[PDB]
Structures are given as structure tokens and as C-alpha cells.
Design an enzyme around this catalytic site. Sequence first.
Site, mmCIF file in Angstrom:
data_model
loop_
_atom_site.group_PDB
_atom_site.id
_atom_site.type_symbol
_atom_site.label_atom_id
_atom_site.label_comp_id
_atom_site.label_asym_id
_atom_site.label_seq_id
_atom_site.Cartn_x
_atom_site.Cartn_y
_atom_site.Cartn_z
ATOM 1 N N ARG A 3 3.835 -14.800 -46.449
ATOM 2 C CA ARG A 3 3.461 -14.497 -45.640
ATOM 3 C C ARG A 3 4.618 -14.527 -44.421
ATOM 4 N NH1 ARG A 3 1.076 -19.777 -43.250
ATOM 5 N NH2 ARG A 3 -1.000 -18.988 -45.202
ATOM 6 N N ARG A 65 5.902 -23.445 -39.174
ATOM 7 C CA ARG A 65 4.825 -22.169 -39.647
ATOM 8 C C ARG A 65 4.712 -21.866 -37.911
ATOM 9 N NH1 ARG A 65 4.314 -23.263 -44.660
ATOM 10 N NH2 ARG A 65 2.266 -22.775 -44.499
ATOM 11 N N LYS A 101 3.754 -29.911 -42.698
ATOM 12 C CA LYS A 101 4.203 -28.935 -41.864
ATOM 13 C C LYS A 101 3.939 -29.525 -40.293
ATOM 14 C CE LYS A 101 -0.226 -26.211 -43.570
ATOM 15 N NZ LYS A 101 -0.110 -25.214 -44.937
ATOM 16 N N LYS A 103 3.699 -26.993 -36.361
ATOM 17 C CA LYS A 103 3.131 -26.124 -35.866
ATOM 18 C C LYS A 103 2.933 -26.451 -34.034
ATOM 19 C CE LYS A 103 -0.522 -25.462 -39.393
ATOM 20 N NZ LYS A 103 -2.056 -24.737 -39.818
ATOM 21 N N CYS A 320 -11.925 -18.359 -42.680
ATOM 22 C CA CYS A 320 -10.226 -18.862 -43.522
ATOM 23 C C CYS A 320 -10.258 -17.226 -44.384
ATOM 24 C CB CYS A 320 -10.482 -19.886 -43.020
ATOM 25 S SG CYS A 320 -11.039 -20.293 -45.255
ATOM 26 N N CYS A 326 -7.837 -18.430 -52.719
ATOM 27 C CA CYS A 326 -7.742 -19.479 -51.693
ATOM 28 C C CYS A 326 -7.825 -20.435 -53.536
ATOM 29 C CB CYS A 326 -7.643 -20.269 -50.599
ATOM 30 S SG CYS A 326 -6.804 -21.443 -50.217
ATOM 31 N N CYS A 365 -13.575 -24.844 -46.401
ATOM 32 C CA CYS A 365 -12.460 -27.024 -47.293
ATOM 33 C C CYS A 365 -11.852 -27.399 -46.422
ATOM 34 C CB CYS A 365 -12.057 -25.962 -48.573
ATOM 35 S SG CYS A 365 -9.226 -26.430 -48.644
ATOM 36 N N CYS A 369 -8.059 -24.585 -41.972
ATOM 37 C CA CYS A 369 -7.577 -23.262 -41.856
ATOM 38 C C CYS A 369 -8.781 -22.557 -40.816
ATOM 39 C CB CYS A 369 -6.964 -22.787 -42.608
ATOM 40 S SG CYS A 369 -5.944 -23.049 -43.997
#
EC number: 1.8.1.2
Length: 456
Positions: A3, A65, A101, A103, A320, A326, A365, A369
Site C-alpha cells: 500500500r 496511516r 495505528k 489515522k 472492504c 484478507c 469482520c 475496514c
Amino acid sequence: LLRCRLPGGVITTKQWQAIDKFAGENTIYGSIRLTNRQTFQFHGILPVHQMLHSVGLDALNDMNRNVLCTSNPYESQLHAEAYEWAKKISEHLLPTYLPRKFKTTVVIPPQNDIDLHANDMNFVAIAENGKLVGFNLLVGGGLSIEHGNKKTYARTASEFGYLPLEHTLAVAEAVVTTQRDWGNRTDRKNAKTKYTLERVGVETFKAEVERRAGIKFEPIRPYEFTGRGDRIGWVKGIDDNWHLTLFIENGRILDYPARPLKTGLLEIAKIHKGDFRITANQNLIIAGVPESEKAKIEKIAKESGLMNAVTPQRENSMACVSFPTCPLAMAEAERFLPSFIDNIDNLMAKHGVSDEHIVMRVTGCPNGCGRAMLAEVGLVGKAPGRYNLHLGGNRIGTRIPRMYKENITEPEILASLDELIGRWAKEREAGEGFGDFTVRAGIIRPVLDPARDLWD
Ligand code: SRM
Ligand code: SF4
Ligand SMILES: [C-]#N
Ligand SMILES: [K+]
């Protein structure tokens, strides 16, 4: 899986051609997948850094991120400065080790396309006379939950106050370091800023940010949002420039039989004057097209199937990646969304609401995302073919949907929606969104204080 760090989702046509080539030659899937954080991913890489570095790109110890920036503001002139700031925060935040993380976003009201409530730090642009004068700081959003674990929760960002443009970087650093120091030292699932704020309190965290930054926040300045969708089609920018936003289902760019989406974007890349902007809705904007060039660009996009008309419902739905790539996936999302929306389109048509839309998202899940936890109708994967159905968010994304039904299948989800959409189509007030309606009509209790009332 790779990414790219791409502040504001802005990528050059030169950079695009370099990523298009790599996707096609050196990955298993041969696709470019636009993410909902305004960047892209390669899947099944079999050098990428040298290919990125060669076109001036880089892939991000670093919990920072991609920094998002409203992609297509109504007041077109504000983009340049807001973008310059998203880029400044992004580099300023590049290596302090974060517990989880982090954001960040730069928002240009009235658009909340970047979905600010899913992020730790948000700078809402305040402008006067077409010039940015400062930012309203909102801190603490996060959507990730763990099934049945009432100690985890989705949370919306909290307003701290306004800060003159000059204090931006100092305030940004202060929020990061305060979170870094106060974050939970033991458990990784309670280390996110949203958890820290709830433990210490917004005012405590705020006071520390002021002390560390060397400023006192001013009262919040007025702002409001009208929506989160992209502006599909042509919109007039500044000068004689136009912006063509293309709807890309699941943001998956691949050449399909009769729909050469990938080649199409390459052909446009070769003749386009400005750059592209990857949106937080997994779409793509061909930006800065001189009015004289509109016809050339449009011919290609049309021939390639990039402008195939979809319903407003499809344009406001998201999912997502999930399977097959994934490893944390529990239920299909990207691969489920298309036919699922085929079904939803039927239901909207059946109720005389084919021109309407419901912000509908599927996440594979509980990590979240797909941002289902900020949707009007969110589907959260629980097992193969099963999802928790959440209802009650709103069009603008400032409310968390409460779980309405648990671990149910598509036929079960569709039956519930068939019924609710019908009540909405017949009982809603003028201009009332589906989410608000389920709350007004008592179908679902609203989530007023996520840390305390999200779970039943
Ligand atoms: C591509 C994307 C979804 C999409 O279809 O667009 C995505 C894909 C993945 N996410 Fe995400 N996340 C994406 C946006 C987000 C969002 C929404 C947002 O940021 O706007 C969330 C929810 C908001 C939040 O962070 O609270 C999100 C919360 C997670 C989590 C939970 C983190 C947490 O704080 O608990 C994980 C798993 C983890 O890190 O432990 C994760 C993990 C993953 C990984 C990288 C799985 C992994 O850890 O190996 C997924 C890669 C799947 C694949 O095969 O490609 N992803 N993920 C988005 C990539 C964003 C980017 O370019 O940086
Ligand atoms: S929500 Fe879960 S399944 Fe979907 S991409 Fe994120 S980690 Fe994978
Ligand atoms: C998800 N990153
Ligand atoms: K999309």
C-alpha cells in the site's frame, strides 16, 4: 500486499502509468485496488520500492496511516490549500512509536466524504474569503470492535476547539505524543486514542494538548456536513477546468470482458492534463480537465465502461477487501457487495425509491475496514455468509449504528430490509434519510454515547 503513502489521494498520470504497469506484470491478481483511505493496493506481489521511488512514491514502527483530504469540494478553490496541509501533516507525522495505528484527515465542509468519525485526528477546514484561516480539531474516532467483547466499541471524534492555521503542526504533534504516552501500555485492543480519551477524559487530554502545543484552543467555529458521497460525473472546477469522477465498483481496477476498466484508465492517463484523485469512496477523479478536453476524456471513459450508469444506491454503498486476500476475513465483502446491491436495487425499485439511497456498507469482520460502523445500514461479517446487521446511522456519518440483528444470512438480511425500506418509502418525512427514520420510527434505539451505550 503493498500500500502506498499518498496524501489526499492525489496521484500524477505519470505515477499512474507506473503503477498500472506493475499491477499488470508483477502481481497475481493484476489489479489496482483503490482503498477507502485514498490510496491503492497491489494484491499478490511476487523492487516495488524502486518502482515507487522512481516515480516519487513511497510505502510507509510507523503507525501513521494515509492522511485523507476532501477530494472534490463544492468551493473548488479550497482544495489546493487543504491538500497542501494534508501533505504537510503527513510528512510532519513521518518518523514516536504509537500503541496502535493513527489515522488523520483534513475535511472541507460541507463534505464528510473522508468519514472523519473513523479517525483519531481530524482538521476541519475553516475558510474566510476563499482562504483557509484555521481548523476545528476533532479527536478520537475509531470503528474497530471485537465480536461480543463489550470492552471494545466504535467511537465518534470529539471536538477540542479551533486553532489558527499557524498552530497546525504543533497541535498535530501534540495529539500524537499525548496518545503515545497515555495509551494503554498493557493491552493492544484498548490502546487506540478513542480508548485513551474515555479513560482520561476529553478535557484532560485537551488540556495536555494545549500545554504541549503552546496554545489555547478557541471555541469551535460553525461547520456542518451535507453528505459523504462523491460527485459522480462532471463538475465544474476553477478556471475552465472540469472534474470527472468515475464510479468504480469496490475500487477494483481490472480489465473485464467488455469492460476494459484498467486499460481505459491507462488510455486516459496518457492524454490527461492534470492528475487523478483517489477518493475515500474507492472512486477516481480525473481532475483538471480543460473544457476543450472533456470530449476526449469522456469518449474513452465511456468506451471502457468507466461511465456505466449505476443507481444512486450503488454509488453510496461500500465494502472492504475481505476474501480472497484478507487473512482476518470472516465473511465476503467486496465479492458479495455487487450482487447484494443487485438485490437492494430491486427492493428500492419495488418501493418507488430507485432514485433514493441508503449509505450501505459491508465489512468482512469487526475490524471494520468497510466503515459499516458509520453507515445507515452496516453489515458486519461474523462467519461465512453471516453478518450482524446494524441500523441507525445517518447520511453524514455522525452516528454509530446499533446492532439490529445478529449472525444472519443474506436471505434473512434482505427480508428485513424489504420490510424496513417499505416502511421508510411510505412513512418518512420530506427528505428524511433511512437511518434517521429507523431511529425516529423506533425501529432501533440510537447510540448516544458509544463507550457506554453501543452494546445491548
Ligand atoms: C483496503 C482497506 C479496506 C478497503 O476495502 O478499502 C483495508 C484493508 C485491510 N485492513 Fe483496514 N482497511 C482499510 C481501512 C480501514 C478502516 C477505515 C478507514 O480507515 O477509513 C478501518 C476502520 C477504522 C479504524 O481504524 O478504527 C480499518 C481497520 C482495520 C483494523 C482494526 C484496527 C484497530 O484499531 O483495531 C485492522 C487489523 C489490525 O490492524 O489489527 C485492519 C487491517 C486490514 C488489513 C491490512 C488486514 C491485515 O491486517 O493484514 C486488510 C487488508 C485486506 C486485503 O487483503 O487487502 N484494518 N481499516 C482500507 C485500507 C486503508 C488504507 O489505505 O490505509
Ligand atoms: S474488515 Fe476485516 S475482512 Fe475487511 S478488509 Fe478489514 S480486516 Fe479484512
Ligand atoms: C486497515 N488498515
Ligand atoms: K466505490
